[PDB]
Amino acid sequence: DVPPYFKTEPVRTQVHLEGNRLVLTCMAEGSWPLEFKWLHNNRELTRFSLEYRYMITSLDRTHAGFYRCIVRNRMGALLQRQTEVQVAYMGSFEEGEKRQSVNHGEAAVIRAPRISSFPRPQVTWFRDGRKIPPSSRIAITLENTLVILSTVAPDAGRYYVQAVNDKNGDNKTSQPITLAVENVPADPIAPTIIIPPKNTSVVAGTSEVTMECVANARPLIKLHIVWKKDGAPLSSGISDYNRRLTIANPTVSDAGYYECEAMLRSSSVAPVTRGAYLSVLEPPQFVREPERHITAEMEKVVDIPCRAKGVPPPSITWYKDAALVEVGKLTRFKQRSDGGLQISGLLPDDTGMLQCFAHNAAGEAQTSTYLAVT
Amino acid sequence: DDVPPYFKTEPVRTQVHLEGNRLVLTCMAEGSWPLEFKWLHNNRELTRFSLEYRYMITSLDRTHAGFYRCIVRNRMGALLQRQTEVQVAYMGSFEEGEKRQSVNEAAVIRAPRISSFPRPQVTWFRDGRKIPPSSRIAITLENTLVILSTVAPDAGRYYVQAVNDKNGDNKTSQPITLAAPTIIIPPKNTSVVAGTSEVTMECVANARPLIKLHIVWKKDGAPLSSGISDYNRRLTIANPTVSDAGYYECEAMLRSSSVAPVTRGAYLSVLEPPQFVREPERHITAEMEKVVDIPCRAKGVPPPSITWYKDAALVEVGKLTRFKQRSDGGLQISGLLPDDTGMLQCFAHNAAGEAQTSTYLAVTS
Ligand SMILES: *[C@@H]1O[C@H](CO[C@@H]2O[C@@H](C)[C@@H](O)[C@@H](O)[C@@H]2O)[C@@H](O[C@@H]2O[C@H](CO)[C@@H](O)[C@H](O)[C@H]2NC(C)=O)[C@H](O)[C@H]1NC(C)=O
Ligand SMILES: *[C@@H]1O[C@H](CO[C@@H]2O[C@@H](C)[C@@H](O)[C@@H](O)[C@@H]2O)[C@@H](O[C@@H]2O[C@H](CO)[C@@H](O)[C@H](O)[C@H]2NC(C)=O)[C@H](O)[C@H]1NC(C)=O
Numbered sequence: 001d002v003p004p005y006f007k008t009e010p011v012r013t014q015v016h017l018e019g020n021r022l023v024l025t026c027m028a029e030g031s032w033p034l035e036f037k038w039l040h041n042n043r044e045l046t047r048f049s050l051e052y053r054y055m056i057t058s059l060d061r062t063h064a065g066f067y068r069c070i071v072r073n074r075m076g077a078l079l080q081r082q083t084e085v086q087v088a089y090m091g092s093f094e095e096g097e098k099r100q101s102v103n104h105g106e107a108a109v110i111r112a113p114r115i116s117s118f119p120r121p122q123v124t125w126f127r128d129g130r131k132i133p134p135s136s137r138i139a140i141t142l143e144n145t146l147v148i149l150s151t152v153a154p155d156a157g158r159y160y161v162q163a164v165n166d167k168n169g170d171n172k173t174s175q176p177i178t179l180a181v182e183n184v185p186a187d188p189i190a191p192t193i194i195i196p197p198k199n200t201s202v203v204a205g206t207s208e209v210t211m212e213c214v215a216n217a218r219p220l221i222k223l224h225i226v227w228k229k230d231g232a233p234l235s236s237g238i239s240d241y242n243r244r245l246t247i248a249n250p251t252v253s254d255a256g257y258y259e260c261e262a263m264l265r266s267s268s269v270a271p272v273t274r275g276a277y278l279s280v281l282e283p284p285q286f287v288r289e290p291e292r293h294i295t296a297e298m299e300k301v302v303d304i305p306c307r308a309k310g311v312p313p314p315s316i317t318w319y320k321d322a323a324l325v326e327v328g329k330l331t332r333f334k335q336r337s338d339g340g341l342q343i344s345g346l347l348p349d350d351t352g353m354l355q356c357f358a359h360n361a362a363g364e365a366q367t368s369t370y371l372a373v374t
Numbered sequence: 375d376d377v378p379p380y381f382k383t384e385p386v387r388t389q390v391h392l393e394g395n396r397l398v399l400t401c402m403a404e405g406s407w408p409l410e411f412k413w414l415h416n417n418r419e420l421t422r423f424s425l426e427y428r429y430m431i432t433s434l435d436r437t438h439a440g441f442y443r444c445i446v447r448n449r450m451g452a453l454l455q456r457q458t459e460v461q462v463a464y465m466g467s468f469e470e471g472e473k474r475q476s477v478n479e480a481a482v483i484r485a486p487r488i489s490s491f492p493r494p495q496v497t498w499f500r501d502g503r504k505i506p507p508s509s510r511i512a513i514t515l516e517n518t519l520v521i522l523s524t525v526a527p528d529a530g531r532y533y534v535q536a537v538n539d540k541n542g543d544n545k546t547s548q549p550i551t552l553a554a555p556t557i558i559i560p561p562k563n564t565s566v567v568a569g570t571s572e573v574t575m576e577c578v579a580n581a582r583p584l585i586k587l588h589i590v591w592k593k594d595g596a597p598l599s600s601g602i603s604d605y606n607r608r609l610t611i612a613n614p615t616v617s618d619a620g621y622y623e624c625e626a627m628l629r630s631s632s633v634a635p636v637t638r639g640a641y642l643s644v645l646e647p648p649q650f651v652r653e654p655e656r657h658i659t660a661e662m663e664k665v666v667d668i669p670c671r672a673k674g675v676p677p678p679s680i681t682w683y684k685d686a687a688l689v690e691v692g693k694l695t696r697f698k699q700r701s702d703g704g705l706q707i708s709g710l711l712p713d714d715t716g717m718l719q720c721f722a723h724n725a726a727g728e729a730q731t732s733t734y735l736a737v738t739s
């Protein structure tokens with residue numbers, strides 16, 4: 001007569017190839033009969049049974065999503081930590097041949113043709129069978145967009161993409177995009193920001209996070225890009241002709257407003273500044289947890305603690321036997337600001353498994369306890 | 375036409391895959407043509423240099439498990455990819471047959487040897503009935519069954535049902551027939567990386583009468599009242615940090631009589647993978663016959679060793695007349711020759727993992 005508990009919990013995220021087999025397991029121990037139910041995106045896949053496995057013999061892209069199990073017995077029920085199954089795939093290039101025009105000196109922006117893939121494929125740009133590497137005048141953005149900084153007469157022509165998926169090794173080629181250059185002498189062009197920094201969120205402890213800013217000017221040689229954090233100039237982590245700002249091992253202290261300032265050296269031209277926010281996140285970690293086993297007298301009031309910390313601050317949710325606790329309607333159940341649950345006028349029907357889930361955009365945490373009402 | 379090679383992405387440090395599934399490793403590098411790739415399994419050559427950036431395994435086997443890494447090269451030089459550990463989930467059959475053991479005292483029955491990755495979850499059975507951990511029944515992390523105070527009805531055949539949590543395999547072994555404070559299962563040395571959610575020390579003690587037996591947990595001589603579970607046999611630290619490292623002791627005593635306590639301890643090491651403090655610039659230029667200093671420092675627990683490679687080849691510090699490695703980990707090349715031009719790679723390695731930084735060395739004139 002021992003309440004359920006998980007011997008192991010599944011990983012938060014999983015990447016699998018299409019056509020491969022997937023085996024989900026609900027590894028719990030406890031008194032018989034220990035039965036299991038499976039959920040996909042908070043929707044029931046199966047009924048309660050002695051089958052602790054959920055198996056997909058041939059994985060498809062549509063099978064991607066969140067899976068979790070519920071284990072139960074005569075004592076109560078527990079919700080498994082949910083796992084994200086991601087299916088590696090790559091479709092074909094959707095768009096056909098396209099046409100685009102740019103003025104002489106101004107920047108040509110050619111977006112990579114839309115193709116469905118997970119993860120986003122690595123892109124190599126080609127013109128007439130020749131690779132186009134990043135250079136002083138040619139930039140390739142994180143969105144795999146091709147940017148010609150100072151367009152000239154010979155820049156006109158057909159550009160196409162070779163995209164490769166790094167998980168399944170799929171390699172596909174897109175349709176050509178014809179770029180034309182209009183009004184071909186040469187006069188000074190003011191510095192402008194083509195690809196401004198976008199809002200970027202990343203979890204603490206990742207290997208790298210990158211901000212990006214592509215600027216244009218004529219002459220391009222006079223163009224200089226300055227990176228700032230909260231108004232202060234940054235001198236480290238800058239690469240790719242001052243268009244990339246890379247932070248290795250980002251911390252919550254590295255969060256803030258990052259600005260890209262494009263200027264012309266040896267000139268009186270005023271700079272152009274465009275910025276975005278970097279958010280560094282930390283998953284929930286518990287500060288206060290309930291005891292493994294909680295015993296309490298009938299008709300009395302019990303305080304069950306649950307506090308957690310994270311960036312952003314984690315929301316705290318309670319479950320009673322794998323079912324959501326309604327603190328709104330029930331007079332007996334009250335939720336304290338720290339996240340603790342208070343049950344007043346304890347009835348024998350409150351006996352069972354209580355679970356606390358602390359959730360934030362960076363992840364989820366779970367702690368459980370058995371409430372026995374004497 | 376003159377771009378040194380570089381990696382657009384790096385592979386995950388560890389990946390678990392099922393037997394019979396297909397695995398596709400990719401060497402995602404960019405650079406000037408011809409960009410060729412070579413594959414290595416446990417630092418042994420799998421392929422020759424070719425335009426195939428993929429290594430594909432149609433049907434994964436247990437023998438395919440190990441460390442894989444690629445080398446990318448072109449006219450500019452070569453780079454070593456960060457190695458990835460491919461682990462193949464499987465479970466064989468129970469090898470050993472029926473065994474017999476006798477005890478007068480505690481009965482210690484090891485779980486039957488079965489080949490499996492990962493280690494399977496084990497449920498012990500007696501005569502078709504599950505035997506959960508109790509005041510007198512302990513189950514260790516190595517899945518060894520320990521009956522503390524054996525009695526007449528304790529005798530009989532015990533067997534294990536083992537389940538692999540990755541492929542869902544479930545197998546049953548052959549029966550094993552079984553017919554003063556001491557420490558049976560002492561705390562073992564445990565190393566773990568920070569952020570593993572949990573790490574557990576274990577100590578199983580035996581005494582008659584068992585009710586008077588008491589286990590106290592200590593860290594560096596100081597008693598702990600938290601993280602203790604399973605009848606004081608388990609000490610669990612949630613979200614271990616480098617501060618949690620140190621000597622943990624299990625002390626078993628009797629709350630009566632003059633019998634001396636028994637103490638057994640082990641070391642807990644919390645490790646952090648290498649992270650670079652100082653890195654070389656993307657491109658380093660230097661004059662012929664002169665000396666160049668290329669910096670490389672990194673931190674980790676334990677302190678990471680630092681090794682240099684030149685174009686995916688180990689730098690011979692044995693013949694260190696021109697090449698010297700400073701104690702800080704920096705590389706110095708004296709009497710610079712035009713043949714020193716190319717990709718230099720600095721690998722910072724620790725037991726918790728490895729990190730890599732690269733640079734292009736151009737020797738003028
Ligand atoms: C990019 O996001 C910002 C908001 O950033 C938030 O606030 C920061 C202080 C930091 O904590 C970030 O992690 C947050 O996500 C948008 O800027 C404005 O934000 C304020 C609140 O801070 C909001 O009231 C305004 O409405 C936001 N501006 C607009 C136009 O709605 C900014 O707009 C975002 N960028 C884009 C392109 O949408
Ligand atoms: C467990 O390991 C210790 C040594 O641990 C190492 O040193 C610690 C200071 C710490 O840095 C750990 O991370 C290291 O792994 C073993 O201690 C040895 O004990 C024997 C006798 O028992 C003695 O002869 C040796 O000199 C000791 N070695 C050291 C380095 O002190 C201990 O034996 C290990 N436990 C078991 C059960 O083998």
Ligand SMILES: *[C@@H]1O[C@H](CO)[C@@H](O[C@@H]2O[C@H](CO)[C@@H](O)[C@H](O)[C@H]2NC(C)=O)[C@H](O)[C@H]1NC(C)=O
Nearest residue numbers: 124126129162163164170171172173425426427
């Ligand atoms: C992706 O596949 C394409 C072909 O589908 C490869 O491109 C070929 O490369 C050879 C080698 O010189 C050329 O002879 C062919 O003409 C190319 N085909 C096309 C359609 O251009 C390409 O190499 C593959 N990707 C990688 C990274 O190797």
